[PDB]
Amino acid sequence: HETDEEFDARWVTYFNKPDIDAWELRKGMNTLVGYDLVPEPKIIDAALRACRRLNDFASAVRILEVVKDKAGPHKEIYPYVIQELRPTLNELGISTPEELGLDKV
Amino acid sequence: STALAKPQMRGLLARRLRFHIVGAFMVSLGFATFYKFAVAEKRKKAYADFYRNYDSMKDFEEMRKAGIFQSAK
Amino acid sequence: HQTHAYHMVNPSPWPLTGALSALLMTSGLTMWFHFNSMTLLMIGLTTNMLTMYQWWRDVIRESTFQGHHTPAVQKGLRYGMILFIISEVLFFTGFFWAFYHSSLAPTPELGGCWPPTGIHPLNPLEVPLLNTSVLLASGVSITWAHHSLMEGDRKHMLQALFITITLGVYFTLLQASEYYEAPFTISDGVYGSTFFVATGFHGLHVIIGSTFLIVCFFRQLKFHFTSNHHFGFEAAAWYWHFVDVVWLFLYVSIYWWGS
Amino acid sequence: HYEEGPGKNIPFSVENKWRLLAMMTLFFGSGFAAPFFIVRHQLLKK
Amino acid sequence: MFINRWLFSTNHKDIGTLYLLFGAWAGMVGTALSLLIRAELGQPGTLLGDDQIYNVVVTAHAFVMIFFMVMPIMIGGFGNWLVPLMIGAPDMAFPRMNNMSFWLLPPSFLLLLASSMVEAGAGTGWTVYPPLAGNLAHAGASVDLTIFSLHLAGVSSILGAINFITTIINMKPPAMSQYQTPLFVWSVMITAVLLLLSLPVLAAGITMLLTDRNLNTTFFDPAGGGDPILYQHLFWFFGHPEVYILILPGFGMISHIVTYYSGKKEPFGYMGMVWAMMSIGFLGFIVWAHHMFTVGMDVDTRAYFTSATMIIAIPTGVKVFSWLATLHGGNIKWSPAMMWALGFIFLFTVGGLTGIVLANSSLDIVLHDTYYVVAHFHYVLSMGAVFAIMGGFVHWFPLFSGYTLNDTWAKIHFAIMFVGVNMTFFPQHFLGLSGMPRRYSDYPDAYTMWNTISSMGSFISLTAVMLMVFIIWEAFASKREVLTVDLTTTNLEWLNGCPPPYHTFEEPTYVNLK
Amino acid sequence: SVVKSEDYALPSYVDRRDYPLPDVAHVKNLSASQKALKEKEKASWSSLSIDEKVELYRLKFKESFAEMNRSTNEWKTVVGAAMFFIGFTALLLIWEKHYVYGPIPHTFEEEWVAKQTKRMLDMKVAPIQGFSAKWDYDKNEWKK
Amino acid sequence: MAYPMQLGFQDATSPIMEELLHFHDHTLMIVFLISSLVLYIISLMLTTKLTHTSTMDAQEVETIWTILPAIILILIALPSLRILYMMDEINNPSLTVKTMGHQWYWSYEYTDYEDLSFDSYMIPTSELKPGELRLLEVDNRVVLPMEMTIRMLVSSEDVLHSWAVPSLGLKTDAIPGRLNQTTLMSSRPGLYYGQCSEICGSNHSFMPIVLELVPLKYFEKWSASML
Amino acid sequence: APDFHDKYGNAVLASGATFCVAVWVYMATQIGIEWNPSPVGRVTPKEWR
Amino acid sequence: ASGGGVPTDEEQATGLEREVMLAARKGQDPYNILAPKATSGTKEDPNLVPSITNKRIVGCICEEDNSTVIWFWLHKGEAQRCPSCGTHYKLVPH
Amino acid sequence: FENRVAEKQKLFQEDNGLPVHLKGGATDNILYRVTMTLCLGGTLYSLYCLGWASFPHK
Amino acid sequence: KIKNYQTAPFDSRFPNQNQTRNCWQNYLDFHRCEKAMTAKGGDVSVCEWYRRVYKSLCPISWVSTWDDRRAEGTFPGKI
Amino acid sequence: ITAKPAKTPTSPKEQAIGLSVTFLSFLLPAGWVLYHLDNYKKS
Amino acid sequence: ASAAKGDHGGTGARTWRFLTFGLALPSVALCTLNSWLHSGHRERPAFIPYHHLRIRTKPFSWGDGNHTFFHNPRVNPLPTGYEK
Ligand SMILES: CCCCCCCCCCCCCCCCCC(=O)OCC(COC(=O)CCCCCCCCCCCCCCCCC)OC(=O)CCCCCCCCCCCCCCCCC
Ligand code: HEA
Ligand SMILES: CCCCC/C=C\C/C=C\C/C=C\C/C=C\CCCC(=O)O[C@H](COC(=O)CCCCCCCCCCCCCCCCC)COP(=O)(O)OCCN
Ligand SMILES: CCCCCCCCCCO[C@@H]1O[C@H](CO)[C@@H](O[C@H]2O[C@H](CO)[C@@H](O)[C@H](O)[C@H]2O)[C@H](O)[C@H]1O
Numbered sequence A: 001h002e003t004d005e006e007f008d009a010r011w012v013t014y015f016n017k018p019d020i021d022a023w024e025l026r027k028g029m030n031t032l033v034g035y036d037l038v039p040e041p042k043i044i045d046a047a048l049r050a051c052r053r054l055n056d057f058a059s060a061v062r063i064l065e066v067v068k069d070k071a072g073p074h075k076e077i078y079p080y081v082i083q084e085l086r087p088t089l090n091e092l093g094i095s096t097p098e099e100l101g102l103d104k105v
Numbered sequence B: 001s002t003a004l005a006k007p008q009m010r011g012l013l014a015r016r017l018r019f020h021i022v023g024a025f026m027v028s029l030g031f032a033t034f035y036k037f038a039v040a041e042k043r044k045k046a047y048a049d050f051y052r053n054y055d056s057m058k059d060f061e062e063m064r065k066a067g068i069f070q071s072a073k
Numbered sequence C: 001h002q003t004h005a006y007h008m009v010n011p012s013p014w015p016l017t018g019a020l021s022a023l024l025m026t027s028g029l030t031m032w033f034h035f036n037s038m039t040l041l042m043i044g045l046t047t048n049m050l051t052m053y054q055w056w057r058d059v060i061r062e063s064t065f066q067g068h069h070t071p072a073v074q075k076g077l078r079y080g081m082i083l084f085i086i087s088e089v090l091f092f093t094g095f096f097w098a099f100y101h102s103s104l105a106p107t108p109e110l111g112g113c114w115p116p117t118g119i120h121p122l123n124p125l126e127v128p129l130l131n132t133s134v135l136l137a138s139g140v141s142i143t144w145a146h147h148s149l150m151e152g153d154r155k156h157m158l159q160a161l162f163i164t165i166t167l168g169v170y171f172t173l174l175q176a177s178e179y180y181e182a183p184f185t186i187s188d189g190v191y192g193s194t195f196f197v198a199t200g201f202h203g204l205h206v207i208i209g210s211t212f213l214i215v216c217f218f219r220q221l222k223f224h225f226t227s228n229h230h231f232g233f234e235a236a237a238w239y240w241h242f243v244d245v246v247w248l249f250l251y252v253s254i255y256w257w258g259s
Numbered sequence D: 001h002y003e004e005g006p007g008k009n010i011p012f013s014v015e016n017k018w019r020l021l022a023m024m025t026l027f028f029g030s031g032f033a034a035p036f037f038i039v040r041h042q043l044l045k046k
Numbered sequence E: 001m002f003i004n005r006w007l008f009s010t011n012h013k014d015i016g017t018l019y020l021l022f023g024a025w026a027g028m029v030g031t032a033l034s035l036l037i038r039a040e041l042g043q044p045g046t047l048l049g050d051d052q053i054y055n056v057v058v059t060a061h062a063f064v065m066i067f068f069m070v071m072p073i074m075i076g077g078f079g080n081w082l083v084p085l086m087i088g089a090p091d092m093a094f095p096r097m098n099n100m101s102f103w104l105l106p107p108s109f110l111l112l113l114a115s116s117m118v119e120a121g122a123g124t125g126w127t128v129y130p131p132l133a134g135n136l137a138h139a140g141a142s143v144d145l146t147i148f149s150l151h152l153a154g155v156s157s158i159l160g161a162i163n164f165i166t167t168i169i170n171m172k173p174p175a176m177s178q179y180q181t182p183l184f185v186w187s188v189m190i191t192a193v194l195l196l197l198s199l200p201v202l203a204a205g206i207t208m209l210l211t212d213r214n215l216n217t218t219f220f221d222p223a224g225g226g227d228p229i230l231y232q233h234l235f236w237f238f239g240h241p242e243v244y245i246l247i248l249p250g251f252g253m254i255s256h257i258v259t260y261y262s263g264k265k266e267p268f269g270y271m272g273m274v275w276a277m278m279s280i281g282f283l284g285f286i287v288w289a290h291h292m293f294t295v296g297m298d299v300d301t302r303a304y305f306t307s308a309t310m311i312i313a314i315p316t317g318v319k320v321f322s323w324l325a326t327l328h329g330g331n332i333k334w335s336p337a338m339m340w341a342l343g344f345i346f347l348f349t350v351g352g353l354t355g356i357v358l359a360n361s362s363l364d365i366v367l368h369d370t371y372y373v374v375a376h377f378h379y380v381l382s383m384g385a386v387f388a389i390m391g392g393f394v395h396w397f398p399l400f401s402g403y404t405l406n407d408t409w410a411k412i413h414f415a416i417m418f419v420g421v422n423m424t425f426f427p428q429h430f431l432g433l434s435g436m437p438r439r440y441s442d443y444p445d446a447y448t449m450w451n452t453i454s455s456m457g458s459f460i461s462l463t464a465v466m467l468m469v470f471i472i473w474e475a476f477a478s479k480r481e482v483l484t485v486d487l488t489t490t491n492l493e494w495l496n497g498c499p500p501p502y503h504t505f506e507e508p509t510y511v512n513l514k
Numbered sequence F: 001s002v003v004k005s006e007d008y009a010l011p012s013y014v015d016r017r018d019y020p021l022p023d024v025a026h027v028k029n030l031s032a033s034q035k036a037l038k039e040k041e042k043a044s045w046s047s048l049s050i051d052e053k054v055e056l057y058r059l060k061f062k063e064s065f066a067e068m069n070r071s072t073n074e075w076k077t078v079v080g081a082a083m084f085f086i087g088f089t090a091l092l093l094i095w096e097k098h099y100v101y102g103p104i105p106h107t108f109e110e111e112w113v114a115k116q117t118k119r120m121l122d123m124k125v126a127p128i129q130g131f132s133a134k135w136d137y138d139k140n141e142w143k144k
Numbered sequence G: 001m002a003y004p005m006q007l008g009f010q011d012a013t014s015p016i017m018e019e020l021l022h023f024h025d026h027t028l029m030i031v032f033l034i035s036s037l038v039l040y041i042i043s044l045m046l047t048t049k050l051t052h053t054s055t056m057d058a059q060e061v062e063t064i065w066t067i068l069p070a071i072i073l074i075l076i077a078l079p080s081l082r083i084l085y086m087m088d089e090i091n092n093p094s095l096t097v098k099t100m101g102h103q104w105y106w107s108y109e110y111t112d113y114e115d116l117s118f119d120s121y122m123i124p125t126s127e128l129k130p131g132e133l134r135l136l137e138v139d140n141r142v143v144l145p146m147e148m149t150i151r152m153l154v155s156s157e158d159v160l161h162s163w164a165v166p167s168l169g170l171k172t173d174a175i176p177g178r179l180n181q182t183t184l185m186s187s188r189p190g191l192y193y194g195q196c197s198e199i200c201g202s203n204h205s206f207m208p209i210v211l212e213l214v215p216l217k218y219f220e221k222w223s224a225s226m227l
Numbered sequence H: 001a002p003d004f005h006d007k008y009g010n011a012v013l014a015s016g017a018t019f020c021v022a023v024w025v026y027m028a029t030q031i032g033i034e035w036n037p038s039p040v041g042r043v044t045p046k047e048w049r
Numbered sequence I: 001a002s003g004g005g006v007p008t009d010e011e012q013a014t015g016l017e018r019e020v021m022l023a024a025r026k027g028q029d030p031y032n033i034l035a036p037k038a039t040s041g042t043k044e045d046p047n048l049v050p051s052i053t054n055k056r057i058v059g060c061i062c063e064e065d066n067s068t069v070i071w072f073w074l075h076k077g078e079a080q081r082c083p084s085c086g087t088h089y090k091l092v093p094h
Numbered sequence J: 001f002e003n004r005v006a007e008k009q010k011l012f013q014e015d016n017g018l019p020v021h022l023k024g025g026a027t028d029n030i031l032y033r034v035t036m037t038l039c040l041g042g043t044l045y046s047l048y049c050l051g052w053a054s055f056p057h058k
Numbered sequence K: 001k002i003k004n005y006q007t008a009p010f011d012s013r014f015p016n017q018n019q020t021r022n023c024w025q026n027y028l029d030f031h032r033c034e035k036a037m038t039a040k041g042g043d044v045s046v047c048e049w050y051r052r053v054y055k056s057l058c059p060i061s062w063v064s065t066w067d068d069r070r071a072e073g074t075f076p077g078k079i
Numbered sequence L: 001i002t003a004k005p006a007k008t009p010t011s012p013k014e015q016a017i018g019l020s021v022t023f024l025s026f027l028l029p030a031g032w033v034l035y036h037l038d039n040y041k042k043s
Numbered sequence M: 001a002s003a004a005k006g007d008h009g010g011t012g013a014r015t016w017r018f019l020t021f022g023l024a025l026p027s028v029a030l031c032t033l034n035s036w037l038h039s040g041h042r043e044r045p046a047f048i049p050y051h052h053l054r055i056r057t058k059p060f061s062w063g064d065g066n067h068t069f070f071h072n073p074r075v076n077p078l079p080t081g082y083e084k
């Protein structure tokens, strides 16, 4: 019932659709976070670039927050994902929640 | 300087469940052994030890001498 | 304004008057059994009949006269009547259980036999057999009435339904006579107890079912039923077949096997 | 037709919270007190 | 307008509201009776009187808690409010007959109060066994008033069962099959089938008791060839189904609550949950004589009833594990309703397991008619049926009223009740194992410690009950109006707002068949 | 901003960590400067300041994840108040003992209990485990 | 009899009561295990921020959830039914004693040979001799020979009662018009207490049972002296 | 801004616990409740006959 | 053997019963007795949801045999999508 | 008999706001008042009888 | 003839907890036997086994009531 | 769930009044009966 | 058996009328004949005051308390025997 790689590839393809609309962005992220996994950086990268095509900076930040949330107590996952995404963050000018102060309670 | 290693990212909930259900089973076995020893077997031994050399007439005579009976003085 | 097919019933006082009638009938029975008085009971019986009359009157107003019985509504009433009959079957089942319990294990006080010492049962081949043929025949005539109605035949519906009612009344009169003539009574131990309580509740249901058929008879006289829409008639026919089947079980169990 | 909305779909008023407290006090208090007064009734009989 | 609306109702929400108010008042009566029981037992000696006044209190306690509190709240209250909304129906099938099911209950309760006021009351046990309940050992009107109270409650519930079955079968959207209706709706349908089949048999048995008391029949009197044990069979043929009637709507509410506060769109294993409730309902008709293991039945009959009773653990275990599997992976919201439901899962399991102990007829010889039975059934009733009622009440109060409770107060309430019921009933296991009988106003001295603790626990529960009244008052006093409710896509009863309009689904939902 | 009762049938905002992108924006109406900010968002986000990025976030969302997931001191109130009411219950029990309960039976007097204990040992109540098993019949004392 | 703060069963006085103790220990171990496992799994489900809220397939796991409880039920039923049929097995009694329940006391009849019968009433609390047990002593005890298989027949001359002696694992309902049989065998001499175990009216709490188990020769002489 | 629990939670917890312990200890020990504990290790058996 | 005299529904049905009868003859279902058949549900071919007002609740059985129904208000205007499966619905008021 | 159902349909569909239990006219109101009077009066009488039966009588 | 009676033995006709019919049957048998003997000219001593069994098993009040009803002519069993 | 602030806020003092009244409504009538039990029993 | 009739082709009122007049009512007529050939008193048995019959644990709520509801003096003895 489909490899990890086939799953990730379906999701990359989903977010990479050039004319993806706002509804499809939200549907995708809200569906994805129901699964027992933290999404691979390559999925998050495609979702963040969808945010860019949709001119939605806030949803890009929210997506980074939900990556951290899905890792639960595994505190090593989120800094790894951010590390892997730094080229995309720099290219698109996406500030992390931490850089925006949005990790303060 | 250094980069971070890729950690496990998928199936973390399922992994947690499997590990602890297995641990629950091991503890359940540990408990069953403790209970057989501390309760079930203890009771069998107490009853077997009590009756092994039990003298019902001697028991009766002790009770009779203590005055407990209507039918035996 | 609705765009479903179901019936939003006008606010109605009959649920409250019916509930109070139940209070008056039960506290009335208590007053009769323990305080030598029938007053409360008579009030409760009266308000009960008034409640039933006006409630079912209104159902006729809602359906024949106002058109609220769409097919969806009629289908619900079919389920309601079937479920009601099922609950009545289970009520009688308790009395059959009592009968078999006592007759299959007759205790020493009875003589350790069934029928008990000193009980002389009715001959099941005399009036009980007659009553059996009467209710079976009425199940045939009500079926004729049903088909006449569906075929649009007013005169033969009325004839068949009248014959059905007459047979119901014949059964009731025969049973009343058998009650008077019986040499045993309800106080004649568990034989009399099971016999009269079980056949007595059955006789009450025969009277109820006969009344329902009579309601249908007068509604038919007044042209309420169409050849396709006549659930009150169907419900009365189902109830009547239920009363016939309960009789057949009573006949086989108490009158024949229990003799 | 009927009143709709919060505080309107109930057979008791909630327009004044202190009148409501009184009504709730009588309502639940009377249910709780009844068995005690029935016991008192039965004790005072014989 | 007030009389038209509240005495002449044909509206499923208003009638549900009437049932909730009635059940809440009954709950106070039942609580007071439970406190009188535990006051009598809270120190050795006699407080109130001999076993007659004591067992009138015990008997009324049970009837009030069962017939006037649990059944009206679960079936008449939550059932009427929620079932039509959960299937998009505009009301019940028979909305005027529905009002008579409600209005039969105040007269039923009046008859029960009358039974306790006349003569010396009905000190019979809620089972009303003859000959103690017959016209020599209970001469006078009390037992007949009890019988008539049960007749009216029985008619009320039989007609209600007819209404719910018809509504649930006939009034769903045309595209919705029975396997697309929520589990609470299933739980009510199955409860209604149990009511339909079981209450007429009770009606038959208590009518025979009435005629033995007043018409000189002898169904249960050996002098006429009758048998006291026949009454027990007829009673328990109803009475075992009755305990499944008491818990099944609770199971339905627990499924909804656990799903909702887990953040899930659906319960785990829906068709297994349907199967399990149907299986429990079916098995619940073939086990009744485990209430009669000491009456002198043949050994093979005892073996059958032991075995059939134990089978019930299998579908029930599927439900427990499926609730756990619904929690699994949830975004857990630690609401007060969730706390009630979590307490339910655990404490219902404990009580169901002591029920499996009792199912063993050999052990039941020593446990029958002792406090081990009392401990068992209050785990499933005071910590199961009641916890589901409290969870459902806290969860749906904002739907019914349009106002929110104070959640901190509701959690305080849960905490107090949890301590109180466990302090009340846990020690009763020890009293039962060590031989304290049921229906006693006083006990040999050795039993004093656990009776003292149990009575102290009952007073903690009293404090929780009083606090519940205050909490409901505070909510209506402060008038915090609901705004947004999450998860409406899988909880249709919320989608018409809080409270929903008097008429809902005047235009039915659109559901296509595809 | 302001959510109204009459809005219950419209798509609504929620902060929930498993529904990260709600069905509507937290803020629907934009001032002149907020409109200009949404225009600027169409250009490179590197040219937005930190404050502008925060303002865009707070137009879209009400609470951050860290805010919506924060813990509270509520448990102290709950536990403390529960213990208060449990303590209040003991006042009721004290009242009951003082004004409702009379003397317990004379069989609880110390001398009665001492004699009854001896008689239970004389009839060897529970001699395998429960009671007399704990008495040393040879040394005439409770087993240590 | 029960003793203060008792948690479990009274000590066994008959072999069948000993069987019941071991069977209860077995079943209670299972009850504890299952309850503890459910409580533990609850806590496990509730203690992680990890989530998985999409649809979960149930088919696989429900095999475990039904087959394992079925096995456990069979492991309870086997020893349960063994004891049940052991209880029922023919034993050939040496003695038959009848007891009739009444409001509110028990009568006893020993009519194998002579017409011996007497009434047995609770000792009132005000008349207890020092060291006697409140609500449990009777004026006339049910004297019986120890180490012998005895047939008890139980009935009632009024309402239901039930004749119970927990030490011996006995409870038999007392039903008018019915003669119920049970067997009793005490491994030891002594005094074994029980209490009426079917609600029977005003003094249901106050009609106890006291068996006095002694050697046959003492029982015989007691019997003769009770004529 | 601090809520009720930030402001008062510590006091509620401490006062509630102190009150609860004190009044239950008083009830359990000072008002003549007979708990009827086991005589084992506690009662000196005394001649009765 | 066989006269007449029993009214037909055509002659005597009235009120809502008669409205349902007459509409069924025309193949119309104004009182929602039948389940609507789905379209492909694309944005191009949305399910058309009649209403006598400007919003109606839709229940979406996203896949055949799902036990979970997904419920939402459909409002007049641009087609909306089921939040679970995305199938499109458009309100056709009046 | 002749079929007068159409007449009754017109009467019970008249747009007069009356609930169905009163819509036949003045006789409905009379029968309703009789029923409700017997019910409420009988219920008060039953409460009196409870009162009487709740106490012993010499 | 084969005495040493202690109590009534197990009887396969009545193997269950309810022993009512065992008492009843032996009461009937004894009295049937006694009727046959007192008449035709034999000794009631051949009835003795039934006498011992019913006396062992039957509650005194049952025997007493049955005896009274035989004297009254209201005993419902066949003797 | 979300909700509006209270339309008619119930202050801590008002809650203390409502709680006290509620508790007294249960406790006073039962307490009166239980206090007078002996008065009833011997009469 | 399963009887011995015939019929069908399309069910109807005519067939059920045929059954009503051709089978059902003739059967009632036959049983009415049979029943009234066997009617008239049979002799009432000796009165015996059996204790399982003529039960009185509470007076009946009508009459003198001692008569059943459909008491027939000819065949229903009182606890003390037949009435004069
Ligand atoms: C389960 C209900 C939840 C609340 C429970 C509250 C109760 C507190 C315990 C909190 C923990 C309760 C767990 C069970 C304690 C068993 C005590 C016992 O010695 O039982 C012994 C037997 C009889 O045994 C014997 O014949 C040999 C006795 C040897 C005695 C030596 C001295 C022992 C210490 C004496 C003092 C104990 C006093 C206990 C006094 C307790 C008063 C309240 O009695 C029985 O069968 C009792 C039958 C109980 C059947 C229900 C099982 C529920 C299990 C819950 C599992 C999860 C854990 C909950 C963990 C907590 C989850 C929240
Ligand atoms: C809500 C009410 C309720 C419910 C649901 C139940 C549920 C059960 N009850 Fe209980 N019971 C009562 C209320 C209830 N009972 C009452 C009121 C009485 C006394 C009546 C009176 O005399 O007044 C009583 C009496 C009673 C008796 C008679 C005892 C006696 O009088 O001597 C018995 C006997 O078998 C019994 C058994 C059971 C069983 C087997 C269940 C089963 O349905 C329980 C099934 C649940 C589980 C087993 C737990 C969950 C399962 C798992 C986690 C799976 C794994 C488990 C195993 C492998 C064992 N009950
Ligand atoms: C073809 C005849 C049809 C029956 C009509 C007779 C009136 C009875 C009305 C209801 C019948 C239903 C069963 C009631 C129980 C007993 C009546 C049994 C049938 C009957 O009529 O039995 C008669 C006795 O009636 C009696 O005691 C008492 C009769 C008067 C008391 C009526 C019953 C009072 C109790 C009613 C309880 C109702 C409980 C209903 C619960 C429903 C479910 C909630 C028999 O007469 P008999 O002189 O003993 O013997 C004949 C000797 N020649
Ligand atoms: C299980 C449910 C009940 C739980 C416990 C109830 C707790 C009691 C609350 C107070 O109840 C009151 O207590 C008073 C005593 O404190 C009683 O006054 C009585 O005693 C007073 C002081 O001795 C006199 O002044 C009064 O006249 C006299 O009525 C009074 O009547 C009663 O209402």
Ligand code: CUA
Pocket (backbone or CB within 6 Å): G101, G102, G104, G160, G161, G162, G196, G197, G198, G199, G200, G201, G203, G204, G205, G207
């Ligand atoms: Cu005798 Cu209880």
Ligand SMILES: [Cu+2]
Pocket (backbone or CB within 6 Å): E239, E240, E243, E287, E288, E290, E291
């Ligand atoms: Cu049961």
Ligand SMILES: [Mg+2]
Pocket (backbone or CB within 6 Å): E294, E368, E369, G162, G197, G198
């Ligand atoms: Mg019992």
Ligand code: NA
Pocket (backbone or CB within 6 Å): E040, E041, E042, E043, E044, E045, E046, E047, E441, E442, E443
């Ligand atoms: Na007491």
Ligand SMILES: [Zn+2]
Pocket (backbone or CB within 6 Å): I060, I061, I062, I063, I070, I082, I083, I084, I085, I086, I087
């Ligand atoms: Zn969908």
